[PDB]
Design a protein around this motif. Structure first.
Motif, PDB file in Angstrom:
ATOM      1  N   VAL A  38       0.906  -1.162   0.000  1.00 17.79           N
ATOM      2  CA  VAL A  38       0.000   0.000   0.000  1.00 17.79           C
ATOM      3  C   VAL A  38       0.928   1.191   0.000  1.00 17.79           C
ATOM      4  O   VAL A  38       1.587   1.431   1.018  1.00 17.79           O
ATOM      5  CB  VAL A  38      -0.957   0.062   1.231  1.00 17.79           C
ATOM      6  CG1 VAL A  38      -1.799   1.332   1.214  1.00 17.79           C
ATOM      7  CG2 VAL A  38      -1.859  -1.168   1.322  1.00 17.79           C
ATOM      8  N   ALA A  69      -5.279   3.379  -7.547  1.00 15.59           N
ATOM      9  CA  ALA A  69      -5.836   2.121  -7.046  1.00 15.59           C
ATOM     10  C   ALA A  69      -5.102   0.981  -7.723  1.00 15.59           C
ATOM     11  O   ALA A  69      -4.636   1.160  -8.855  1.00 15.59           O
ATOM     12  CB  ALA A  69      -7.317   2.031  -7.378  1.00 15.59           C
ATOM     13  N   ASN A 107     -12.136   5.824  -3.962  1.00 11.50           N
ATOM     14  CA  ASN A 107     -13.231   4.867  -3.841  1.00 11.50           C
ATOM     15  C   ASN A 107     -14.466   5.425  -4.514  1.00 11.50           C
ATOM     16  O   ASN A 107     -15.233   4.682  -5.099  1.00 11.50           O
ATOM     17  CB  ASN A 107     -13.545   4.577  -2.367  1.00 11.50           C
ATOM     18  CG  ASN A 107     -12.563   3.682  -1.658  1.00 11.50           C
ATOM     19  OD1 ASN A 107     -11.572   3.184  -2.230  1.00 11.50           O
ATOM     20  ND2 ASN A 107     -12.777   3.534  -0.361  1.00 11.50           N
ATOM     21  N   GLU A 108     -14.681   6.735  -4.353  1.00 12.86           N
ATOM     22  CA  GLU A 108     -15.787   7.509  -4.889  1.00 12.86           C
ATOM     23  C   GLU A 108     -15.542   7.648  -6.367  1.00 12.86           C
ATOM     24  O   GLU A 108     -16.480   7.515  -7.146  1.00 12.86           O
ATOM     25  CB  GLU A 108     -15.874   8.878  -4.172  1.00 12.86           C
ATOM     26  CG  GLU A 108     -16.597   8.807  -2.829  1.00 12.86           C
ATOM     27  CD  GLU A 108     -15.990   9.487  -1.608  1.00 12.86           C
ATOM     28  OE1 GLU A 108     -15.438  10.605  -1.748  1.00 12.86           O
ATOM     29  OE2 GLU A 108     -16.135   8.929  -0.494  1.00 12.86           O
ATOM     30  N   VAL A 109     -14.267   7.859  -6.768  1.00 13.62           N
ATOM     31  CA  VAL A 109     -13.848   7.917  -8.179  1.00 13.62           C
ATOM     32  C   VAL A 109     -14.292   6.610  -8.824  1.00 13.62           C
ATOM     33  O   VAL A 109     -15.065   6.647  -9.776  1.00 13.62           O
ATOM     34  CB  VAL A 109     -12.325   8.118  -8.324  1.00 13.62           C
ATOM     35  CG1 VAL A 109     -11.844   7.684  -9.708  1.00 13.62           C
ATOM     36  CG2 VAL A 109     -11.941   9.569  -8.044  1.00 13.62           C
ATOM     37  N   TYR A 110     -13.861   5.461  -8.238  1.00 18.77           N
ATOM     38  CA  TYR A 110     -14.214   4.115  -8.643  1.00 18.77           C
ATOM     39  C   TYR A 110     -15.723   3.988  -8.816  1.00 18.77           C
ATOM     40  O   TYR A 110     -16.161   3.525  -9.854  1.00 18.77           O
ATOM     41  CB  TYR A 110     -13.713   3.074  -7.620  1.00 18.77           C
ATOM     42  CG  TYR A 110     -14.208   1.700  -7.974  1.00 18.77           C
ATOM     43  CD1 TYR A 110     -13.511   0.903  -8.872  1.00 18.77           C
ATOM     44  CD2 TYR A 110     -15.457   1.253  -7.544  1.00 18.77           C
ATOM     45  CE1 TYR A 110     -14.023  -0.321  -9.305  1.00 18.77           C
ATOM     46  CE2 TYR A 110     -15.979   0.032  -7.972  1.00 18.77           C
ATOM     47  CZ  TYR A 110     -15.258  -0.750  -8.856  1.00 18.77           C
ATOM     48  OH  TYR A 110     -15.743  -1.947  -9.302  1.00 18.77           O
ATOM     49  N   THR A 113      -9.120   6.053 -11.504  1.00 12.82           N
ATOM     50  CA  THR A 113      -8.395   6.274 -10.234  1.00 12.82           C
ATOM     51  C   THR A 113      -6.951   6.702 -10.511  1.00 12.82           C
ATOM     52  O   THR A 113      -6.435   7.543  -9.774  1.00 12.82           O
ATOM     53  CB  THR A 113      -8.359   5.050  -9.323  1.00 12.82           C
ATOM     54  OG1 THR A 113      -7.781   3.974 -10.038  1.00 12.82           O
ATOM     55  CG2 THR A 113      -9.711   4.675  -8.749  1.00 12.82           C
ATOM     56  N   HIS A 150      -8.453   9.751   3.565  1.00 12.17           N
ATOM     57  CA  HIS A 150      -9.191  10.631   2.661  1.00 12.17           C
ATOM     58  C   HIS A 150      -8.832  10.420   1.197  1.00 12.17           C
ATOM     59  O   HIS A 150      -9.702  10.588   0.338  1.00 12.17           O
ATOM     60  CB  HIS A 150      -9.052  12.087   3.083  1.00 12.17           C
ATOM     61  CG  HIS A 150      -9.395  12.297   4.524  1.00 12.17           C
ATOM     62  ND1 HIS A 150      -8.552  11.864   5.535  1.00 12.17           N
ATOM     63  CD2 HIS A 150     -10.482  12.884   5.080  1.00 12.17           C
ATOM     64  CE1 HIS A 150      -9.147  12.215   6.665  1.00 12.17           C
ATOM     65  NE2 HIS A 150     -10.307  12.838   6.440  1.00 12.17           N
ATOM     66  N   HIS A 151      -7.575   9.998   0.926  1.00 13.36           N
ATOM     67  CA  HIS A 151      -7.090   9.710  -0.414  1.00 13.36           C
ATOM     68  C   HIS A 151      -7.756   8.427  -0.947  1.00 13.36           C
ATOM     69  O   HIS A 151      -8.285   8.432  -2.059  1.00 13.36           O
ATOM     70  CB  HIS A 151      -5.559   9.639  -0.422  1.00 13.36           C
ATOM     71  CG  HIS A 151      -4.995   9.242  -1.753  1.00 13.36           C
ATOM     72  ND1 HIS A 151      -4.865  10.155  -2.779  1.00 13.36           N
ATOM     73  CD2 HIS A 151      -4.579   8.033  -2.190  1.00 13.36           C
ATOM     74  CE1 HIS A 151      -4.338   9.487  -3.793  1.00 13.36           C
ATOM     75  NE2 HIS A 151      -4.151   8.210  -3.487  1.00 13.36           N
ATOM     76  N   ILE A 152      -7.750   7.347  -0.127  1.00 11.29           N
ATOM     77  CA  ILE A 152      -8.388   6.046  -0.379  1.00 11.29           C
ATOM     78  C   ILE A 152      -9.870   6.302  -0.591  1.00 11.29           C
ATOM     79  O   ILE A 152     -10.409   5.836  -1.581  1.00 11.29           O
ATOM     80  CB  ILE A 152      -8.132   5.053   0.797  1.00 11.29           C
ATOM     81  CG1 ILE A 152      -6.713   4.465   0.746  1.00 11.29           C
ATOM     82  CG2 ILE A 152      -9.166   3.946   0.857  1.00 11.29           C
ATOM     83  CD1 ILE A 152      -6.240   3.848   2.042  1.00 11.29           C
ATOM     84  N   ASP A 198      -3.536   7.034   2.910  1.00 12.01           N
ATOM     85  CA  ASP A 198      -4.278   8.040   3.672  1.00 12.01           C
ATOM     86  C   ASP A 198      -5.764   7.697   3.545  1.00 12.01           C
ATOM     87  O   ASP A 198      -6.177   7.241   2.485  1.00 12.01           O
ATOM     88  CB  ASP A 198      -3.997   9.472   3.183  1.00 12.01           C
ATOM     89  CG  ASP A 198      -4.829  10.515   3.919  1.00 12.01           C
ATOM     90  OD1 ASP A 198      -4.472  10.856   5.067  1.00 12.01           O
ATOM     91  OD2 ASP A 198      -5.877  10.942   3.372  1.00 12.01           O
ATOM     92  N   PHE A 200     -11.271   9.106  -1.495  1.00 14.50           N
ATOM     93  CA  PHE A 200     -11.356   9.869  -2.741  1.00 14.50           C
ATOM     94  C   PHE A 200     -11.391   8.935  -3.962  1.00 14.50           C
ATOM     95  O   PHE A 200     -12.329   8.998  -4.762  1.00 14.50           O
ATOM     96  CB  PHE A 200     -10.209  10.899  -2.827  1.00 14.50           C
ATOM     97  CG  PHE A 200     -10.006  11.523  -4.179  1.00 14.50           C
ATOM     98  CD1 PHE A 200     -11.020  12.281  -4.776  1.00 14.50           C
ATOM     99  CD2 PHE A 200      -8.805  11.349  -4.868  1.00 14.50           C
ATOM    100  CE1 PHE A 200     -10.834  12.844  -6.041  1.00 14.50           C
ATOM    101  CE2 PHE A 200      -8.621  11.910  -6.134  1.00 14.50           C
ATOM    102  CZ  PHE A 200      -9.629  12.666  -6.706  1.00 14.50           C
TER     103      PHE A 200
END
Ligand SMILES: COc1cc(C)c(CNC[C@@H](NC(=O)c2cc(C)on2)c2ccccc2)cc1C
Ligand SMILES: COc1cc(C)c(CNC[C@@H](NC(=O)c2cc(C)on2)c2ccccc2)cc1C
Lengths: 451, 449
Positions: free
Chosen positions: A48, A260, A60-63, A305, A54-56, A52, A58
């Motif tokens: 990994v 990702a 995830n929402e992109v995905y 991502t 908030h980055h993960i 972070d 971010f």
């Protein structure tokens, strides 16, 4: 690898009725409660790269916004074709694309392995069509990724693995002497996965130019670190398209590009080079099939991502990230070089390999393992490595590593014949006939698919 | 999108706000989502339900960091993969094989087809001494076979079909040589959605002592249930002794998120030829079950989630809907004598005409909003029915639009508008030109202007 035997109901058959979603989700989040501390708290080498919350969140929402996209239908998802073309354009620029006369092109793949297999297959196909080679050969250093062996076996390319020097960097002389009229490509790593050393790329790229063969820079690990190490004042020679003889470079967006998992980039100096990567089927009843990478249906959401990550960070984001990692690395190296029972192999910038001429490093590694560390076991020579990420730049992670290592050394220094847990496994493996390493690895892969 | 959105050919100096990036992706999403959500797209999106997608996206979010290359870090995902295989193997009659059926999770059908090809090549070299591998497939068999052939250096002998667009087994029997390492059959084939005579192919395979791979990529999650509902489907899976490997896609009709498929072998002796093992690498001992190293583990969790959330009743209901929707679609098509259905497909309908230009009929439908697949050899278009087509009035609308499409082309037999002459050219073009136009299209796709 198998601790959910008792904890959760296994499934060897589809249930008659569907299990509730709340229940399914409850299991996954419970396993995440057991698994995330390892990487979140900085105990894993690589695995990994950002980490972070908030980055993960971010990405995830992109995905989620792009979860239905498939690049096999650019008509239906032209956004993904934009994302892929834009990832390639940006990566290319960061790896001296302008220098090569604006002819640098490439495609987004699944991983570094895909990128390396596709480059390897391209040189093969290109050298047969233009040089007449029907018995291809590839000259790479011993330190070059395992995927070079994969491509060799798969694509019927003879792989010539050449020695390293006292600094674990590639031996260009050994590389030159390995070149025959059938050499289709020569490669260097920027840096290698074993000891994190940047091979002498300018000298390798000049050697490939002189013989009219390809030069592939496997910058899967350092593609998104080295351009920023250069600008920070760290010792890094030109390793990309700024070198005339460099014909392709791979760099992983899902690694230090902080995207990702499931994305990489394969770049070629010119389109004529790139066209040989493609496969075109013209006489299939199913219509005209044209595919640039290994796969047909591609997870489009992951290209997004990679795009989102590059745009969220920018040149400033990468400079910050790289500086954090190299300062954590400076500090970690300083500490290992302060325990004179241990040695660092070569001079790495952030992927740190530590060995010992005085004690069993495998046992040392086991002591760390007991403290929660997830290090990479290495052989030829027996050592272990720490691929540092943003997870190790967090408060007191390098200090914890150093403390746990001083103890680890002392424990083995007090019991030199100690071999507990995974230590006698690494020891039997380091000196084992390849067929034994074949029978065990097979058994291990089988062990993962048991229900 | 040329001017619709700002191009990014270089990394911005400072990173753009996260909120800003999402808004751009969502903007592009909203223009692209209706096309498949309203069931205008043939295949591409197979479930498309908002609540399922939301469920699967929450599953993604929980396993996002997952990388199966590190089972020690993600033991959750090794369980999901093992379980997706087991459940799939059982659905494809792997019990009839006597519990020896084993496999792995892949990135898609292509990787599953390529893997089987590489495996039979390696297996046959090691056990039969075959250094010049040959593989026999019907012409209807997926283009991935040709990709697999060029990659691993296997001669691919494509055999003709019968008048019912099914494989001519006699043609395949005459194609087998002592260098033949494997045969294949599609269940169903992508072009015309028909199921090849798999028992006859497996019988030929077993008789010759060569492998038999069944390409169930499209039908692996539809055919077991079509049988349970009483539809006529030829036995195609591990129920047949001669079937040595079966590939199926969970990302297609399995209703799992894109980026997952399964390849199954009848015996572990066969499966072991798939694995890659490196012993002398300074980076340690490296092993990889499939092509990839790192993988998005989160995609395997989505297939495991989807499967368990639907179970047998879920897949049966989903399949009941699709097959009924198709029963209606084939009936309506059959009522337009200018058109014909190639073969007798259960749900992937290929309609063609001997009276009118089908590429123009397809062009007319595109104008109405329909996203259909262009097929050549013969010229035709296909509709892969999914759950979006089972929604009210979707099929009725298709047939109204199709009746209108035929009406227009019948009045103007020389009409060649929009994409219709592009397909026409491509079906008539020499291979060298098809290669060149397709290469330019891949370049086109990767252009920043
Ligand atoms: C020669 O001119 C062409 C060229 C092309 C490519 C086409 C489209 N064929 C459709 C084809 N999709 C691609 O191959 C594809 C992949 C990527 C990325 O983008 N597209 C396809 C879809 C589904 C199943 C099988 C194949 C049509 C004409 C007339
Ligand atoms: C039983 O003998 C073995 C066998 C193995 C495989 C190992 C792990 N080596 C570490 C190795 N990971 C795997 O290859 C892998 C793939 C899957 C799935 O799971 N693990 C690795 C990963 C990345 C970079 C470099 C190396 C250790 C011993 C002692």
């Amino acid at each position: 690898i198998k601790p959910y035997r008792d904890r959760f109901p296994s499934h060897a058959r589809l249930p008659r009725a569907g299990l509730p979603r709340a229940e399914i989700l409850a299991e996954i989040a419970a396993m995440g409660a057991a698994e995330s501390p390892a990487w979140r708290d900085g105990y894993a080498s690589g695995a990994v790269y950002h980490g972070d919350e908030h980055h993960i969140a971010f990405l995830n929402e992109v995905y989620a916004l792009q979860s239905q996209s498939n690049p096999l239908h650019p008509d239906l998802w032209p956004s993904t074709a934009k994302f892929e073309a834009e990832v390639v354009a940006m990566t290319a620029h960061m790896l001296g694309g302008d220098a090569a006369g604006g002819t640098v092109c490439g495609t987004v793949t699944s991983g570094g392995t895909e990128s390396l297999l596709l480059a390897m297959k391209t040189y093969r196909d290109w050298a047969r069509a233009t040089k007449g080679i029907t018995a291809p050969e590839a000259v790479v250093p011993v330190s070059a990724h395992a995927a070079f062996d994969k491509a060799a076996q798969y694509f019927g390319i003879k792989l010539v693995r050449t020695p390293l020097d006292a600094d674990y960097r590639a031996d260009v002389a050994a590389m030159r002497e390995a070149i025959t009229p059938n050499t289709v490509v020569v490669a260097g790593s920027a840096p290698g996965f074993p000891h994190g050393v940047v091979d002498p790329i300018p000298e390798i790229a000049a050697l490939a130019a002189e013989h009219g063969i390809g030069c592939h820079v496997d910058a899967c690990l350092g593609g998104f670190i080295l351009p920023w190490a250069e600008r920070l004042g760290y010792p890094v020679p030109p390793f990309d398209f700024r070198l005339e003889g460099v014909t392709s470079v791979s760099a992983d967006t899902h690694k230090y590009g902080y995207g990702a998992k499931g994305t990489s980039v394969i770049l070629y100096r010119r389109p004529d080079l790139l066209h040989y990567q493609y496969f075109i089927a013209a006489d299939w009843p199913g219509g005209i099939y044209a595919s640039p990478t290994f796969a047909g249906s591609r997870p489009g959401a992951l290209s997004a991502t990679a795009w989102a990550a590059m745009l969220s960070l920018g040149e400033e984001g990468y400079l910050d990230a790289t500086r954090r990692i190299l300062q954590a690395a400076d500090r970690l190296k300083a500490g290992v070089r302060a325990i004179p029972s241990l040695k660092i192999l070569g001079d790495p910038l952030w992927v740190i390999a530590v060995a010992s001429d005085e004690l069993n490093i495998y046992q040392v590694m086991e002591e760390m393992a007991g403290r929660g560390w997830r290090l990479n076991g290495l052989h030829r020579p027996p050592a272990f490595h720490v691929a540092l990420t943003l997870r190790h730049t967090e408060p007191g992670v390098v200090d914890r590593f150093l403390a746990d290592l001083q103890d680890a050394v002392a424990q083995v220094r007090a019991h030199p014949e100690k071999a507990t847990g995974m230590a006698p496994v690494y020891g039997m493996a380091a000196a084992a006939p390849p067929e034994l390493v074949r029978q065990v690895s097979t058994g291990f892969i089988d062990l993962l698919y048991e229900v």
